[PDB]
């Protein structure tokens, strides 16, 4: 049961490191979509409306 628990602990470390790198890629994609949302909101004649 100790080698089963240590195999569960190694799989928990691998899924935790994969979720950490995936949330790092998602937050860099979120900053990329923030730069694209700031870039796609340029207008001059909209302020009177």
């Amino acid at each position: 049961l100790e080698e089963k628990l240590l195999d569960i602990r190694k799989k928990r470390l691998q899924l935790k490191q994969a979720s950490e790198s995936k949330l790092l890629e998602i937050q860099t994609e979120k900053n990329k979509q923030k730069i694209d949302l700031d870039s796609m909101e340029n207008s001059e004649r909209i302020k009177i409306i």
């Binding site: 190694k10 928990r12 995936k22 979120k30």
Partner: protein, 327 residues
């Protein structure tokens, strides 16, 4: 608009409580009920209606309210008492913003919204919620870890054991606070930077008793460092208590060091895998990690063959020496 009649005023505001949405909270309806608070004073049907308005839209009201324990209305299941008083009684006169932390009730509410999660008003509520412990596992931001260092180092320093007037009730709450730490270090699989900084200042000041089992599990989940930094701060002050205390302490050191040999070798087994960044070969870094752990086992192996001479061949220590070499 039925609030102009004063005799119907608790009867209107209970119907206003059950029919309020987010779009129904309007700033002129803030303005009239603050004028009714100034004219006819504090009434419990008007304070409970503004308590729901602070529960729905706090930004529209500039007047803060108390948060005291009141029943606010008819409640607590009194439907037979309502029917007895119904005969003749009281009938004559894409979003880049943030998500609030208090709306997380269960597990799938955080699974739908993890990319927008705000920061709380204190760092003591991170240990209270297990849903906030999932946020620490995947975020490697710098000021969210330094503010957690600035809180819990002040928690272990002021509310410790020997800084008090020897209260057994506050030591039970300090034992219950250390049970939160040893489940948080195992769920994270790295020790906190507050917790190894407290053991730098407490191992000269510790004698060997007074919640020994919560202190020897606090040394069990310390992360990996160099061998020359640990030995003046830990291994000198451990060996002053190891050869001199009882044999139940001598078995509990080697149960703590076999869990220290678990979590140090678990980090070094996958540090090779997650680093493709350095173009230099890692045989100097693994060779610098080779003599850090081979002098670890030969120090505890020097602790094992010297303490055998102290007790003169007892088998009860000899079961837990060979459990350390199982690792």
């Amino acid at each position: 608009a039925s609030l102009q009649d004063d005799a119907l005023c608790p009867y209107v505001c209970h119907l206003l409580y059950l029919l309020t949405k987010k779009e129904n909270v309007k700033p002129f309806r803030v303005r009239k009920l603050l004028d009714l608070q100034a004219k006819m004073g504090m009434q419990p049907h008007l304070q409970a209606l503004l308590s729901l308005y602070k529960f729905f839209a706090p930004a529209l009201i500039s007047v803060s309210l108390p948060v005291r324990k009141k029943i606010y209305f008819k409640n607590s299941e009194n439907l037979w008492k309502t029917a007895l008083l119904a005969v003749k009684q009281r009938n004559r006169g894409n979003r880049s913003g943030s998500f609030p932390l208090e709306q997380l009730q269960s597990f799938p509410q955080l699974l739908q919204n993890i990319h927008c999660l705000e920061l709380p008003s204190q760092m003591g509520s991170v240990l209270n919620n297990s849903l906030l412990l999932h946020y620490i596992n995947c975020v490697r931001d710098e000021p969210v870890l330094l503010r957690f260092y600035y809180w819990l180092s002040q928690t272990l320093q002021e509310e410790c054991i020997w800084y008090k007037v020897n209260n057994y009730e506050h030591g039970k709450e300090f034992t219950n606070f250390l049970d939160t730490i040893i489940r948080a270090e195992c769920f994270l699989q790295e020790g906190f930077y507050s917790c190894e900084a407290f053991l730098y200042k407490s191992l000269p000041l510790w004698d060997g008793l007074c919640c020994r089992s919560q202190f020897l599990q606090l040394v069990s989940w310390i992360p990996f460092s160099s061998f020359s930094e640990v030995k003046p701060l830990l291994f000198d002050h451990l060996a002053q208590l190891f050869f001199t205390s009882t044999i139940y302490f001598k078995c509990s050191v080697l149960q703590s060091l076999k869990e220290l040999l678990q979590n140090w070798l678990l980090w070094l087994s996958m540090d090779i895998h997650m680093k493709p960044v350095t173009n230099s070969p890692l045989e100097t870094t693994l060779g610098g990690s080779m003599n850090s752990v081979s002098k670890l086992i030969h120090y505890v192996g020097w602790l094992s063959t010297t303490a055998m001479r102290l007790e003169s061949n007892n088998t009860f220590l000899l079961h837990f020496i060979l459990d350390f070499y199982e690792k």
